[PDB]
Amino acid sequence: MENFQKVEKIGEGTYGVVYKARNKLTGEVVALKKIRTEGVPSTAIREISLLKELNHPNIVKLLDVIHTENKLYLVFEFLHQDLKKFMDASALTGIPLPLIKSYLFQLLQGLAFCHSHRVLHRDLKPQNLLINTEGAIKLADFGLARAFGVPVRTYTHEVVTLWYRAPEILLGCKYYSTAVDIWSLGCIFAEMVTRRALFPGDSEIDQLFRIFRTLGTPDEVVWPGVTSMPDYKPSFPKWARQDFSKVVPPLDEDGRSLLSQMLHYDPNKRISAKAALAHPFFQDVTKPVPHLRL
Numbered sequence: 001m002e003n004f005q006k007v008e009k010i011g012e013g014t015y016g017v018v019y020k021a022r023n024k025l026t027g028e029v030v031a032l033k034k035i036r037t038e039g040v041p042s043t044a045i046r047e048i049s050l051l052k053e054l055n056h057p058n059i060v061k062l063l064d065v066i067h068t069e070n071k072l073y074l075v076f077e078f079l080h081q082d083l084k085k086f087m088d089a090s091a092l093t094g095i096p097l098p099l100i101k102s103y104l105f106q107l108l109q110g111l112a113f114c115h116s117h118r119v120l121h122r123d124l125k126p127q128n129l130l131i132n133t134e135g136a137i138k139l140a141d142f143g144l145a146r147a148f149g150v151p152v153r154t155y156t157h158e159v160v161t162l163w164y165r166a167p168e169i170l171l172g173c174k175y176y177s178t179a180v181d182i183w184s185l186g187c188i189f190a191e192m193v194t195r196r197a198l199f200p201g202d203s204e205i206d207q208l209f210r211i212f213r214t215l216g217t218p219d220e221v222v223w224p225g226v227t228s229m230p231d232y233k234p235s236f237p238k239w240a241r242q243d244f245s246k247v248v249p250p251l252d253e254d255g256r257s258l259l260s261q262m263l264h265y266d267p268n269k270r271i272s273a274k275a276a277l278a279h280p281f282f283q284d285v286t287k288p289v290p291h292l293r294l
């Protein structure tokens with residue numbers, strides 16, 4: 001990269017490779033994401049160019065967009081660690097509840113902001129959540145399937161994670177609502193608490209059935225319209241819903257209650273980010289600083 005200096009490769013997202021780089025001129029350290037190849041749509045670059053204005057303390061700042069040679073480069077502010085790494089590093093002891101609560105609260109603030117601006121993330125996962133030494137956590141990547149789509153892998157043979165995908169997506173809904181982000185965040189919340197992914201599916205059907213085995217196979221009573229969904233099959237096994245206290249022990253009732261609302265099957269009953277911020281679980285929220293080893 002003529003203007004930069006790919007310090008190190010720090011990821012390989014579902015579109016391209018992310019590098020840590022220094023602006024040889026400004027000297028600023030940034031995350032540079034290279035995107036795939038035969039001209040690159042102008043509709044996306046306009047969708048992207050729209051993200052530059054989406055600034056919030058809990059959203060990774062998109063600094064520059066550069067189109068050149070069937071290659072699209074996205075320049076983002078750099079953060080030192082992602083939540084996946086932090087969770088793995090905290091696996092022995094667990095992330096303290098107050099920090100879990102702070103991170104959840106901040107991510108809901110970030111989502112309330114995006115959603116009020118009619119922007120959906122669509123692919124929330126621990127690897128797309130970045131943290132710093134000051135205790136902030138920010139939303140990164142944003143997918144962009146409305147300006148690109150769901151990739152078969154990433155760009156070069158890679159197993160896309162389905163663990164955080166909302167059921168309406170798995171059932172073939174063609175129009176996603178902001179509810180898909182609340183579902184993913186609920187899955188991440190559970191994972192921070194238990195130190196185990198909630199629904200670790202290894203295929204779309206296994207992902208769906210893992211959800212059904214835990215929350216019960218949905219029906220018209222809890223999810224009006226579900227049996228008419230594109231990929232719904234009357235032949236799906238009928239599993240009973242599991243007691244919620246068994247899913248995220250030892251989370252307190254306030255936490256369970258909020259998680260249950262973030263995981264409602266019906267996208268329309270699923271709690272909004274705005275409403276979640278008002279939940280009693282956050283009455284005593286604070287902003288602890290994490291112990292980060294960089």
Ligand SMILES: NC(=O)c1ccc(Nc2nc(N)c(C(=O)c3cccnc3)s2)cc1
Nearest residue numbers: 010013031076077078079080081082140141
């Ligand atoms: N695992 C690591 O050591 C690690 C180190 C530093 C990072 N730091 C990152 N900073 C930004 N801004 C990132 C992104 O904007 C991003 C994230 C995910 C997909 N696409 C773009 S990744 C992330 C991970």
